[PDB]
Structures are given as C-alpha cells and as structure tokens.
Amino acid sequence: LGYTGLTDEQAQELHSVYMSGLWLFSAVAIVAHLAVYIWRPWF
Amino acid sequence: GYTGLTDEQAQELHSVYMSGLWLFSAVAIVAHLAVYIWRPWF
Amino acid sequence: LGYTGLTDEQAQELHSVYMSGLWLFSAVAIVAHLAVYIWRPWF
Amino acid sequence: GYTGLTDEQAQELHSVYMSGLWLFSAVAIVAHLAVYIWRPWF
Amino acid sequence: LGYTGLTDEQAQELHSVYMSGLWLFSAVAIVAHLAVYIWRPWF
Amino acid sequence: MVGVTAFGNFDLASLAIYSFWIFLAGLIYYLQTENMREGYPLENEDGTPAANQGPFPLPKPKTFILPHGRGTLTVPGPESEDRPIALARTAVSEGFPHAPTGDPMKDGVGPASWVARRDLPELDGHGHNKIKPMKAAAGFHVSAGKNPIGLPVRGCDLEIAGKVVDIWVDIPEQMARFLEVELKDGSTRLLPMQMVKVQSNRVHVNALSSDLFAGIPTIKSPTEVTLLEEDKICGYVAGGLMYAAPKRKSVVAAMLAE
Amino acid sequence: AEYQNIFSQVQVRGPADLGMTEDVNLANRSGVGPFSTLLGWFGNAQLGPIYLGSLGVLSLFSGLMWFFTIGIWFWYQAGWNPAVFLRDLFFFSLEPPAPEYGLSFAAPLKEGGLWLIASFFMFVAVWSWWGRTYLRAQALGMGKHTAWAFLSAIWLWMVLGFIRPILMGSWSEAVPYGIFSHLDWTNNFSLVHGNLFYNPFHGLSIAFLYGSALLFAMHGATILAVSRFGGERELEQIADRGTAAERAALFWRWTMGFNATMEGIHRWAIWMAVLVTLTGGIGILLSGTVVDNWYVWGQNHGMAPLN
Amino acid sequence: ALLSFERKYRVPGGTLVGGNLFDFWVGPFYVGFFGVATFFFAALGIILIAWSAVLQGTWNPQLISVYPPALEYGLGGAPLAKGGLWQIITICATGAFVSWALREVEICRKLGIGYHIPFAFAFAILAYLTLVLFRPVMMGAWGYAFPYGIWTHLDWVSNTGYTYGNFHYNPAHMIAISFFFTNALALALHGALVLSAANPEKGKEMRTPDHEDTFFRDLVGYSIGTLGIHRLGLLLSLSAVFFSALCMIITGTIWFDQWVDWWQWWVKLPWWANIPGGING
Amino acid sequence: MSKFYKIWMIFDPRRVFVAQGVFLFLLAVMIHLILLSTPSYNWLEISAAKYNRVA
Amino acid sequence: MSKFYKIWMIFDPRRVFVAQGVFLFLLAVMIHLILLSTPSYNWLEISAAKYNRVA
Amino acid sequence: MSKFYKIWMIFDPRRVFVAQGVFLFLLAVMIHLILLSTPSYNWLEISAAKYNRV
Amino acid sequence: SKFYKIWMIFDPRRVFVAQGVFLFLLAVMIHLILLSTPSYNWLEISAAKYNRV
Amino acid sequence: SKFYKIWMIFDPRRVFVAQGVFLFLLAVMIHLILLSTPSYNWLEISAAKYNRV
Amino acid sequence: SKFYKIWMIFDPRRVFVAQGVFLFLLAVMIHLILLSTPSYNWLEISAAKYNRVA
Numbered sequence A, C, E: 001l002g003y004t005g006l007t008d009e010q011a012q013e014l015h016s017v018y019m020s021g022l023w024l025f026s027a028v029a030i031v032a033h034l035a036v037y038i039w040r041p042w043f
Numbered sequence B, D: 001g002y003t004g005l006t007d008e009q010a011q012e013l014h015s016v017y018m019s020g021l022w023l024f025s026a027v028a029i030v031a032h033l034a035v036y037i038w039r040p041w042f
Numbered sequence F: 001m002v003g004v005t006a007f008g009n010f011d012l013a014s015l016a017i018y019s020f021w022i023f024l025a026g027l028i029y030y031l032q033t034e035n036m037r038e039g040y041p042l043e044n045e046d047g048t049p050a051a052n053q054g055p056f057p058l059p060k061p062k063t064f065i066l067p068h069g070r071g072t073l074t075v076p077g078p079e080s081e082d083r084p085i086a087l088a089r090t091a092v093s094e095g096f097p098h099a100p101t102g103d104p105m106k107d108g109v110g111p112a113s114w115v116a117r118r119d120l121p122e123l124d125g126h127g128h129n130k131i132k133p134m135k136a137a138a139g140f141h142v143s144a145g146k147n148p149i150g151l152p153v154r155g156c157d158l159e160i161a162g163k164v165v166d167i168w169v170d171i172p173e174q175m176a177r178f179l180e181v182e183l184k185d186g187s188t189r190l191l192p193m194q195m196v197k198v199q200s201n202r203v204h205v206n207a208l209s210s211d212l213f214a215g216i217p218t219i220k221s222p223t224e225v226t227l228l229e230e231d232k233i234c235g236y237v238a239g240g241l242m243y244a245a246p247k248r249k250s251v252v253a254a255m256l257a258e
Numbered sequence G: 001a002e003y004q005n006i007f008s009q010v011q012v013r014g015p016a017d018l019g020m021t022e023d024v025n026l027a028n029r030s031g032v033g034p035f036s037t038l039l040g041w042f043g044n045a046q047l048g049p050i051y052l053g054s055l056g057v058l059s060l061f062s063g064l065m066w067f068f069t070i071g072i073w074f075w076y077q078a079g080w081n082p083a084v085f086l087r088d089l090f091f092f093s094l095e096p097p098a099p100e101y102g103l104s105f106a107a108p109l110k111e112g113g114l115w116l117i118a119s120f121f122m123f124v125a126v127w128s129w130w131g132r133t134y135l136r137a138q139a140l141g142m143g144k145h146t147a148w149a150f151l152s153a154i155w156l157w158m159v160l161g162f163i164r165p166i167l168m169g170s171w172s173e174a175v176p177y178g179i180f181s182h183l184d185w186t187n188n189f190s191l192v193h194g195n196l197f198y199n200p201f202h203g204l205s206i207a208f209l210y211g212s213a214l215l216f217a218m219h220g221a222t223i224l225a226v227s228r229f230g231g232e233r234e235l236e237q238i239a240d241r242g243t244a245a246e247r248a249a250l251f252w253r254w255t256m257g258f259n260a261t262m263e264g265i266h267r268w269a270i271w272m273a274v275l276v277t278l279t280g281g282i283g284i285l286l287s288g289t290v291v292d293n294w295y296v297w298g299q300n301h302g303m304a305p306l307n
Numbered sequence H: 001a002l003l004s005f006e007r008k009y010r011v012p013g014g015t016l017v018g019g020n021l022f023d024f025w026v027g028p029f030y031v032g033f034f035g036v037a038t039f040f041f042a043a044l045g046i047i048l049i050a051w052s053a054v055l056q057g058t059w060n061p062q063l064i065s066v067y068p069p070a071l072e073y074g075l076g077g078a079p080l081a082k083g084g085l086w087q088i089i090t091i092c093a094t095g096a097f098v099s100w101a102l103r104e105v106e107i108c109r110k111l112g113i114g115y116h117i118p119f120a121f122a123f124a125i126l127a128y129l130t131l132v133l134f135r136p137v138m139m140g141a142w143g144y145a146f147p148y149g150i151w152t153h154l155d156w157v158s159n160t161g162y163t164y165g166n167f168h169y170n171p172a173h174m175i176a177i178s179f180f181f182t183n184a185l186a187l188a189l190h191g192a193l194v195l196s197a198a199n200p201e202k203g204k205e206m207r208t209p210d211h212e213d214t215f216f217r218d219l220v221g222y223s224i225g226t227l228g229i230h231r232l233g234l235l236l237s238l239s240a241v242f243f244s245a246l247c248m249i250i251t252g253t254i255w256f257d258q259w260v261d262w263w264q265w266w267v268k269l270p271w272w273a274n275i276p277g278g279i280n281g
Numbered sequence I, J: 001m002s003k004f005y006k007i008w009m010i011f012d013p014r015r016v017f018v019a020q021g022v023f024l025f026l027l028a029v030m031i032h033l034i035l036l037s038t039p040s041y042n043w044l045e046i047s048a049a050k051y052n053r054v055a
Numbered sequence K: 001m002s003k004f005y006k007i008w009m010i011f012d013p014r015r016v017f018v019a020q021g022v023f024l025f026l027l028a029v030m031i032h033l034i035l036l037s038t039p040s041y042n043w044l045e046i047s048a049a050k051y052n053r054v
Numbered sequence L, M: 001s002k003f004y005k006i007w008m009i010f011d012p013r014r015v016f017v018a019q020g021v022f023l024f025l026l027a028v029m030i031h032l033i034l035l036s037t038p039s040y041n042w043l044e045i046s047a048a049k050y051n052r053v
Numbered sequence N: 001s002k003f004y005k006i007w008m009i010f011d012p013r014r015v016f017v018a019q020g021v022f023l024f025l026l027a028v029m030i031h032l033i034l035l036s037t038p039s040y041n042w043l044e045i046s047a048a049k050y051n052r053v054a
C-alpha cells in the first residue's frame, strides 16, 4: 500500500489506462503476426 | 515481518501473484502442448 | 500521484499539443512509406 | 536469538518452509520417476 | 566461557539439535552408500 | 582515400598528424598557463618581482566560490606570505640556500615550514567539522589493525615520551588522521598518522626525538583543529626529519650525519 | 623502513555515509552495502549506495543482454558442457560476420548474425551509461569532465567496432567478443596494416598511455609524499594552499624546472588520459581507410631507413 | 626566478654527497652532487647520439639509430662505429637516470617529504635496466637490447614480440596491460572528478570531497577515497612496470616457444584434456 | 484477475514504464535482427529475389 | 502450502519482482536460443525446408 | 486511448521529449543505414544502375 | 526434530536468497551436464528417433 | 562427551556457513571424481548398458 | 499550432546548440557519403563531363 503512495482508486484508474494501451499494443501485434503468417507462415 | 506488510496485505499480494502465476503457467502449458503436437521431443 | 507536479488541465493541454505533433509526424511518415512502396515495394 | 525471531515465529517459518521443501521434493521425485521410466540411468 | 556469549545450556541444546542433523545427514549417506555398493561395489 | 596525396607525400594521414602537432602545441600552452595561477608572478630572493617571468604569460583570472560561505578565491591574484620568514641570505648571488637565523623548527622555515591558511576547521559537505576526535565522533571505532590507543610513544632517540590517548578521524573519508599523544606534562599533542608507525607494542615516531615532543604546536580547541593548526603540526613533525638528525640513533642517520 | 602510507595501519568504521543530496532523486538511490575490511586497508571500506535511474536501467538491461548473449554463444560453442565451458572460456569467441556479407544483415545467426545482436546490446549499454555519467554529474551540479573524458573512450570504442567497419564496408573488420579472439584481432590488425607501430597516431597514444602511467606514478607518489601534511585533501589545497601544495610544487620545480598547481595537475591528468583514446581513434580510423601499410607509409615519410 | 612562496623552503642540508659544495640552485633547478653527474651524463649522452648520427650518415632525427653491438661481439666491448657508441650511451643513460633519482632524494630530504617519487622512478629504471642490461646479459649478447632510435626501437619491440609469436599471450604481459589500461582509466576518472568538483557548473559553489565520493558512489556504487586513489595510482603504475619488467625477463630466458603454446597447459589439464567438443578438440 | 490493478500499489509507475519501454524496444530489435539473420524471412532479401532487384 | 503468502512478509515484492522479471526473461531467452542452436527445433529453418524456401 | 494524457501527470515532459528525440533520430539512422547496407535498397546504387552512371 | 531453531541462528532473508541462487545454479548445472552427454540430450535423441536430420 | 562446549567457542552462524559450503564442495568434488573415472560414470554406464550410443 | 510552448519546457540555448551541431554533422555526413560513391562524386562528374582527366 505505502510503497507507492497511490490509493486504490488511483491504481484502478492507472491500471485501466495501462491495460487500454496494452490491449491496443496487443491488438496491433496480433494483426501484424497475421499479416506475416498470411504472407509467409512459419509453421 | 521484515517487509512491514501485514498478513492481510500479504494474503492479497499472494492472491494476485498466484493468479498471475497460474495464468502464466496456463499459457505455458498450452505452449508446451502445442509444440509437442507440432514437434514432440520425447 | 502527481510526481511531475503538473495540473490535470496542463496535462490535457500538453497531451493535446503532443498528439498534434504526433499526428503530423505520423502523417509525414505514412506519406513517406507510401511513396517508397510505390517506387520500390518490399512485398 | 541472532535473528530476533520468536520460537513461535521460527516454528511457523519452519512449518511453511518444510511444506515448500516437501512440495519441491515431491515434484522432483515425480520428475525423476518420469525420467527413469522414459530413460533409466541405472 | 564467553567467547560467543552463548549460554552453556544454549550450547547443550544447540549441539543436541546439531548432532540430530548430523546423524540424520549421515543416515542418508549410509543408505546412499549402501545402495551404491549393492549397485556397484568398490571393493 | 588510400594513397591519395594532396602534394608530395602529404596525404590525409599526414594532414592529421601535423594538425595534431598544432593541437598538441596549443594544448601544452593551455595546460601550462593554468598551472600559473599559483605562486606567480615570480619574485626575487628579497621579495621584489623578478625581471624574468617565463615564456608563458599569465592566464586570465578565474574565481573559485568556496563552499559553506567561506567566500571566493580569484587566481592568479596577489599572494603574500603573511608571516616573518626567519631566514638569512648566505650569498649575495641568487640561487643559494638561506640559512635559518635561529631555531628553524620553532621559526617555521625549511622542512618545518607552514603556510598561513585560514584559521578555521575544515568542513565536510554538510558543514560539520571534517576532522574530529574519535571520542566526539558518533559511533566511530577501530575496525582493523592494531589499536594504537594506550601504546607508548617512542621517539627517534629510542626514548618513550608519552602514550596515545585519542585518535582523530576524518569523518567523510572515515580514516584516522591524527594521534593525540599525551606527554609527561599532562598536555596532549597531535601527531599525523602518516608520520607514525604503530608497531606491535609501541608507536615509533621516527620524525621527532623525545625532547622535541613537547615542542609540537598545540591546538586551541580540544574538539576541533583548524587548517592553520594542521599546517603547524604537520610542518613541525616533518621538519624533525632533517632538524633532529643529530639526535637520531639510526645507522643510516649516522652515515648521512654531518 | 618507516610508514610509507601505502596501506592504512588502522581502520575506523563509523556510520555509513549516505552522500550528498543536491538534486539526486533519493528514490532511485539504493541502500548502503557491506563494509569491506580488505578494501579498507587500501581505500574506503564502505560499498554503496548506488543510484539506479532510467539510464541506469537501460544500461544494465542492455549490458546484461550483451553479457548474456555472449554467454549463450559461449555455451553453444561448449556444447552445453560446463567442463568444456571452463576449459575453452578464453578461447571462445563471438566472431563478426564473414567478409563476404559486407555490411549486410543477411549473415546467418550462427555465422555472424548473433554478433550483430550482441553488439547492438553493447552499443545501447555503453551509450546509455555515458548519459548516466553525464546526468549524475549534472544532478550533483559538478562539471561534465567525466562525461567528456568518457566520450574519449567511446570514440576509440566506436571506431573499433562501428565506425571503421562501416568505412571498410564489412562487419568482418570489427572486434570479436572473446578474451583471446580480441587479442588475436589486435595482432591480425597490425599484420594486415603493415606494422601498426609505424602508425604516427598509434605512437602518440602509446606516448600518452606511457605518460598516464608516468603522470599517475608521479602524481600518486607526490601526494603520498606530501600526505604527511594532509596533501591528499586536494580540494582544500585548491581552495586554501597549505604547505603540502607548496612542497609538491617545489619538489617538481626543483626537479624538472617547472611545476603545476593542485588543480592544474588534474588538467594534465585528464588530458594525458583522454589523448590515449582520442589519438587512438584517429590512428585506427586511418588504418585501412587511408593507409593500407604503415611501414610503406613510414618509408615515404622518413620514418624507415629504406626509401 | 622564485615563486611567491619558494623562499622559506630554500635551506641547506638534506644532501647525500657534497654537503654545501653543490648545494645551490641554477634558476629553478636544484643542482646537488647528483645533478652535476646528471648534467654531465645527460650532455655526454646527447652529444654521442648526435655524433652517432654523423657516423651513421643521416641527419633525420627519426632515422637516427644507435644500434647495440652485434651478436658476434657477445657481452664485450665493440667498435664505437658498430656498437661501441651504444654501450657508452647506455652507461651514460644509466648514470643519468640513477643520478636523477638520487638528486630527487636530496630534494625530498630538503623538503621533508617522503621518498615515494624516487622510489617510483627507480621502478622505471629497473624496467629500463631490464631491457638493456638484465635481459641481454642473460641472453649473452648486447644485440638483444634495443637501439636508441625513435623508430628503430619500435623495430626491436616488433621483432622481439614476433620472435615468440603473438606476444599478447605472454601471461605477465596480460597482467601489465590490464594495469596500464586500468591506470589510464583511473587517471582520467581521477583527473576529471577533481576538475568537476573544482570547476563546477557556472555560479555553483566549488564542490567538496563528499561530492567526489557521492558522484562515484552514484556511478559505480563505490568510492575509493582521496587517499585511496593516489595509492591506487602509485600501485597501478608500479605494478604495470613490475610485470612489464617481469614479462621480458622471462622471455627468451625461461620461455622460448610461442606464447600461445604456453596456454595449452590449461586445456591439457587432466580432468578435461580429453573431453570432446569446444574449441580445443 | 481483477485485483491485478493492485500491482501499482507496490510498483512505482515511473520505474515500470521505463522498464517496459526499454524491454519492448530491445526485444523488438532482437527479433527483427533474428529474422534478418536467417536467409529466409529476411524481408529485405526475399523481395530482392522475388523482383530480381540484384543479379 | 496455504501459508506460502508468508513469503511476502520476508521478501520485498519490489526486489523479488525485479529479480523474477530478470530471471524469467533471461531463462526464456536461454531456452529459446537453445532451440535455435540445435539443428532441430530451429523453427525458422524447419519451415524454410518445409516450404522450399532455401532457393 | 482517450485518457493517455495522464502520462504527463507521471512523467516529466523534459525527460520524455529528450528521450523521444534521441530515439527517433537514432532509429531513423538505423533504418536508413540498414537499407544502404544491402546491395538492394541502396538508392544511391539504384539510380547509378538505373541511368548507367558507371 | 527441533530443526526450526536453525532460523533463530540463520537470517531467513539471507538463507532464502542463498538457497534460491543455489537451487537454480544446481538445476542449471545438472541440466547442462545432461545436455552435454550424447545420451540424455533429449533434443538430440528425439531428432535421432524421428530422423529429423 | 563435552563436545557441546565447542559452540561456547565457535560462532554458530560462521560454522554452519562454513560447513554448508564445505559439505557441498566435498559432495561436488566426490561426484566429479566419480564422473572422471571411466568406471562409476553412471551416465556412461547406462549408455553402454542400454546401447544408447 | 501551440508548438511555441516547447520553449517553456526546453532551454533555448541548449536546443540551439544541439540543432547547430546536429545539422552541421548531418550536412557533412551526407556530403561525405556522396563523395564516397563513384556516382554523385561531383568532382569526378565534372572531370568526366569536360574531359579534365588526361
């Protein structure tokens, strides 16, 4: 709790944005891998 | 308690860590299963 | 929270200008990539 | 003593530590059992 | 009598625990050597 | 550009090597001028500026802003000895030694010389006194080696002139600087740790003889030592190496004795 | 047979010094480590604390991955055999790609491709650390002398591994990652370029490398000689010239005619060492790109008896 | 010709030889008995180098080379035109060096400072005497010494280095090179640190020794201290020279084959000399 | 895995984000260099062979 | 096993997670590079031979 | 995506802007240099062969 | 027995760190020894079994 | 006997650490000696016995 | 645009020095690359065009 000084609501909001970026980063990554697998599959 | 955390905080910290651990293990099991089907090593 | 010491209004203003620069920078790059792909594509 | 742990703390610390030790050794025994079946070394 | 500041009764109990581990450690070693000699004697 | 020569054998490699000689000549000039911020302009053996000042001119002055509000120091600047030098010219022609007029160790001349530094204790980064006795030091203790406290203090004449009482410690560097040697008169002198050799059972001070131990300059405050007091103590003890040679019983001292 | 002040004859161990706090973010600073008596005989006994910021993390991550990548290739070259790993530890090498591939990144992963990955990690590791030296000095408000003294080292380091290979148009000209390999690379460098001794800039770097040993032996002995007057506290001698600074000045003035100051001697110190790599980078850079044989170059410039 | 503070330290005494016979200053220099020997050996050594240029037939300073006597003459005298001059210069150089060290000793005693400087210089002299005297005597020929030329004493280094393959594999050489690199690293760090603490950002106060320790503790997590770094500087330099003297005195005397061949002992250790895989087998 | 947000109650966001950006960039370069290492998947060479850019 | 949460009373979660994060990535890199090193399990080379991407 | 502005509440804009500027320049140099390394995509050599400047 | 008292003597922080380092290095050392040998190199033997080469 | 008094003279922490290092190093030294010999290398023994090579 | 606010974040003095050094170094780098290529070596181009070489 006291290691960062943030509250639960701040952490909840901070995590929500962080996961929002993470899913955006993940979604672009998935689209990118599909493009490679369609153009040149590695399996 | 060297860290100064209370037992309830540790119980919460463990619960998140173990939830993360099982999710990490769950993906790893699927990864090992997929590789074993694609190319078994035994 | 508030390690930077900025205000939320200032943070919104700073991000608004920052994204304006980012879209300008990205817009040039997209045109740059499109011209290069037409001239000589790597796919 | 040197570490300042109470005897109840030492017993609790040892109890969970041995729980981990037997859990670790239990998987190791299963691991050695699987390897010996798959490829014995004796 | 005071090199380590350890009480004489504390030394007695500490040694009793230490010998208990020493016999436990040597007991496994004897079992280990016995199996090896059965598997491959060195005499 | 392999073998590409602008003229003669001069090429890109030749261009670089000559350009460095110009750079190195310029750099040596720059370095030498910086070294001329102390002790200059030169002076005659009487005290007047000499007709010779060197091929390198003096640099433009620069200012050092001293820590803890001690002021500023601009060099090169007018530098004065600020103490009467008890020396006598031994020859009208220059480049000859100046002999002491009286006792050189007491007069602070020659190897026993000292400089009029600021008469204040030296401070750490936090403003506290850098050098304090270990008794007044918080938590300091001897960690390794032979503890010199309580050992007899033997001079160069192989005679005990007291015993160590306290150790002075540089608090930031956390190393001993002085030994507080109590004499037979009840007073305690300071001996630099660099001038003593703590043996198995005694503190051998090769610099000073037993009778000269009383002559060490004393400190105004038992809890701190100023820069000026350090110079007087360090000067006096180190001056003992040449000015107590007749009193030293060493074989090599006898061979090098006059 | 007296006390020469080479090793401390007594150690004192007070509380650990946490250091100054001019502008250093104490959150990024760690705690104090142990006290080493073995280190205390020579210098300070306290280890730590160490600051770890953003550039500190980037330096460590790239530095670890650089160290790790060399290690994995060292294990692969060992066949994953710990006995072989220790036997051929110095003989292992992460060689750069073959000369055929030139500067192309098409080299196979086991034929030079891995070296490019490891070299990238070192590149990021060192440059991130240079900024770390810069920012640590800026945080305490000190001069950037370390940052630019470091940049001299980077110049030679950049030349050997990055700049000279680009000009030569081949990664094969770079340095292998190994104990004996980069020694062999050094020897092969001279032989290919015709007796690198006759490199004028290599000779200058040896002059300043010899001079750095000369100046530090001179400077270290001088301060230890005048340490009996408290001459080791050089910063106070710069601020308030004591008798140690004067005697140190006079010893060299009476020995070799000229002297320096307590602050000006360290200007000689920094420039003596900086030119070691500064002239080194130019000396290596010219080799191959400008001069394909230094002894032939030496002959045409009046350094060898022939021609 | 005197500094603003030089006068009070100009006192008689401290001389090893001559007393006040040579105890005087020529300009800034202090003469002493050993300075007279210094000047004579220095001047005589320099002139014979110039005279050796006349005999050689060249005036280019880089082409000037005072070669030592050929291997046929062994460790005896040689004609001055074909090695004899080198022996005289080496004797003059040896005399000049030792007289310089002993002159520094007199200045040390006059100032009351330690003899670290002449002791440090004596390490260089023994390094010098290793190459010209100790190694050639063991090998039984002055021709194994190096010529007194700017670019011909490099030929000696290259030729002697390649006599034993790649000389990098000399184990004493690796120790000394690590010391030489470490010393230059320490000097750059030490010089830069004090200047950073003494010439800080404009307007900011001159820093204290604590900032010096704070900087290097924030950098690499350890500060050796003002006393330690100067001890480190002295020991790093002397160790580099000591191992450099050691590396040559064992080369051609105890080790004769390629130095890379030496390192096979580690590979040929009994417990892994025959394991397959790796670099060696 | 709702309680995941608690990670920021212990981790400092500044340290994590710097580590995150450093990690992903170094990881992204390593994979791209690995792909360029293999003769296949070298997308700057497969197109060259496809269009016969280089003889 | 139910008392394993007591480990967080002893170990700092910040120190552990940094230690674990470095450990897990370095382990994952070590395993992945081992597979690439072997003639088999080098999945990039495997698919190249499978799809006749050698030429 | 619509709440990313809060990064500037946490991160100092001075440090981020410098880091981004260095990153973008270094990345741009890397890619432009990677293309020049290969015989293909060396647009200097491409035009040289196109117009037969040799 | 009464082995719990070893924690009165040994600091749990130091031991667990030392043990964690010890166990991993032991696990790594054992796994590498098996990988070194042509037998038990489970990657090599599986390739031989399925004729990967 | 009176061997318990050895703990009145030795620091238990240092002895246990030294003993822990000593036993492990001794165990490693013995295990390596067995592997060094052509016999008792149980990895080699199994391969010859079960025809792995 | 409100790009003017970057000067409230960045010190103009340091930025202008960075721009000057970077632009100069970049300008030299491209010119040196062009001279390195046998094509675009305008010294050699003029020599061939007017038959300076003889």
Ligand code: BCL
Residues within 6 Å of the ligand: G122, G125, G126, G153, G154, G156, G157, G160, G185, G186, G187, G188, G189, G190, G191, G195, G196, G197, G201, G202, G205, G206, G209, G276, G277, G279, G280, G281, G283, G284, H157, H181, H184
């Ligand atoms: C047969 C071999 C050749 C020869 C070939 C070369 C070659 C080739 C080179 C030298 C170079 C040097 N040579 Mg030569 N050299 C020979 C003979 C000699 C002799 C002699 C008496 O014979 C001497 C004294 C020297 C002396 C020297 C040095 C002056 C110089 C290196 C400076 C330095 O510090 O580099 C070492 C320092 C660096 C490379 C800088 C490193 C900086 C970076 C930032 C450090 C990063 C650290 C990294 C991340 C690791 C971190 C680890 C963790 C901290 C644990 N050479 C012969 C003729 N020599 C170099 C030079 O500059 O020549 C002009 C060079 O490239």
Ligand SMILES: COC(C)(C)C/C=C/C(C)=C/C=C/C(C)=C/C=C/C(C)=C/C=C/C=C(C)/C=C/C=C(\C)CC/C=C(\C)CCC=C(C)C
Residues within 6 Å of the ligand: A010, A013, A014, A015, A017, A018, A019, A020, A021, A022, A025, C001, I020, I024, I027, I030, I031, I034, J025, J028, J029, J030, J032, J033, K003, K004, K006, K007, K009, K010
């Ligand atoms: C050798 O091995 C090879 C290379 C062959 C194969 C590699 C294998 C390995 C080891 C791969 C490893 C992969 C891993 C571990 C990948 C991990 C990826 C992760 C975790 C990515 C996460 C990305 C997250 C992103 C991009 C999130 C961004 C978030 C934002 C931009 C928004 C943040 C803003 C906030 C929090 C606002 C601040 C809030 C307040 C209240 C002020």
Ligand SMILES: COC(C)(C)C/C=C/C(C)=C/C=C/C(C)=C/C=C/C(C)=C/C=C/C=C(C)/C=C/C=C(\C)CC/C=C(\C)CCC=C(C)C
Residues within 6 Å of the ligand: A001, B009, B012, B013, B014, B016, B017, B019, B020, B021, B024, I003, I004, I006, I007, I008, I009, I010, J027, J030, J031, J034, L024, L027, L028, L031, L032
């Ligand atoms: C050479 O040997 C080879 C390589 C051939 C074979 C390898 C051998 C070896 C030595 C293998 C070793 C394997 C080991 C030791 C594996 C261990 C794996 C473990 C322990 C993995 C753990 C994973 C845990 C994860 C991913 C947990 C994630 C958790 C989160 C993302 C949430 C974190 C947030 C928390 C805890 C919030 C805190 C809450 C409060 C209330 C404060």
Ligand SMILES: COC(C)(C)C/C=C/C(C)=C/C=C/C(C)=C/C=C/C(C)=C/C=C/C=C(C)/C=C/C=C(\C)CC/C=C(\C)CCC=C(C)C
Residues within 6 Å of the ligand: C010, C013, C014, C015, C017, C018, C020, C021, C022, C025, I025, I028, I029, I032, I033, K020, K024, K027, K030, K031, K034, N002, N003, N004, N005, N006, N008, N009
């Ligand atoms: C080896 O791998 C290769 C190179 C082959 C392939 C490469 C792989 C990788 C690792 C690629 C990585 C790519 C990445 C990470 C790209 C990232 C690009 C981004 C995020 C670029 C962002 C650009 C943003 C810009 C230029 C923003 C500009 C903003 C301005 C000019 C305005 C700033 C002014 C402001 C905020 C004033 C307002 C201030 C106040 C106080 C109100």
Ligand SMILES: COC(C)(C)C/C=C/C(C)=C/C=C/C(C)=C/C=C/C(C)=C/C=C/C=C(C)/C=C/C=C(\C)CC/C=C(\C)CCC=C(C)C
Residues within 6 Å of the ligand: D009, D012, D013, D014, D016, D017, D018, D019, D020, D021, D024, J003, J004, J005, J006, J007, J009, J010, L026, L029, L030, L033, M024, M027, M028, M031, M032
């Ligand atoms: C060359 O030799 C070769 C390699 C060929 C053969 C090998 C030879 C040798 C020398 C082998 C050596 C083997 C050894 C020494 C093995 C030792 C194994 C041991 C002792 C393992 C112990 C494992 C214990 C574990 C995993 C414990 C886990 C515990 C937990 C996860 C819970 C921790 C939490 C606690 C204690 C909470 C604290 C409680 C409170 C109330 C604060």
Ligand SMILES: COC(C)(C)C/C=C/C(C)=C/C=C/C(C)=C/C=C/C(C)=C/C=C/C=C(C)/C=C/C=C(\C)CC/C=C(\C)CCC=C(C)C
Residues within 6 Å of the ligand: D001, E010, E013, E014, E015, E017, E018, E019, E020, E021, E022, E025, L002, L003, L004, L005, L006, L007, L008, L009, M023, M026, M029, M030, M033
């Ligand atoms: C070249 O030679 C070869 C390798 C060929 C053959 C080898 C030769 C040699 C020289 C072999 C050497 C053998 C030796 C010297 C073996 C010695 C073995 C011993 C003495 C082992 C002792 C083991 C003791 C153990 C494992 C004790 C464990 C005890 C505990 C776990 C409990 C500790 C806890 C305590 C005391 C709690 C504290 C109590 C209180 C009341 C505070």
Ligand SMILES: COC(C)(C)C/C=C/C(C)=C/C=C/C(C)=C/C=C/C(C)=C/C=C/C=C(C)/C=C/C=C(\C)CC/C=C(\C)CCC=C(C)C
Residues within 6 Å of the ligand: E001, M002, M003, M005, M006, M007, M008, M009
């Ligand atoms: C090359 O030569 C070859 C190898 C071929 C042949 C060898 C030749 C030679 C020269 C061999 C050398 C032989 C020697 C000199 C052997 C010496 C042996 C000795 C001195 C052995 C002594 C052993 C003593 C022991 C094990 C004592 C153990 C003591 C205890 C277990 C109890 C200690 C605890 C105490 C005292 C508690 C403290 C008491 C109180 C009241 C607090």
Ligand SMILES: COC(C)(C)C/C=C/C(C)=C/C=C/C(C)=C/C=C/C(C)=C/C=C\C=C(C)\C=C\C=C(/C)CC/C=C(\C)CCC=C(C)C
Residues within 6 Å of the ligand: G067, G068, G070, G071, G072, G074, G116, G117, G119, G120, G122, G123, G157, G158, G159, G160, G161, G162, G175, G176, G177, G178, G179, G182, I033, K030
């Ligand atoms: C069991 O051990 C483990 C596995 C745990 C860890 C052990 C690791 C080991 C044993 C590591 C050993 C490391 C060694 C022996 C390192 C030696 C390094 C040496 C001697 C280096 C010497 C010279 C290196 C130089 C000059 C390198 C310069 C590199 C650069 C300037 C970077 C160049 C940048 C490039 C090529 C970027 C290319 C990439 C792109 C994307 C453009």
Ligand SMILES: [Fe+2]
Residues within 6 Å of the ligand: G219, G223, G234, G266, H190, H194, H230
């Ligand atoms: Fe210094």
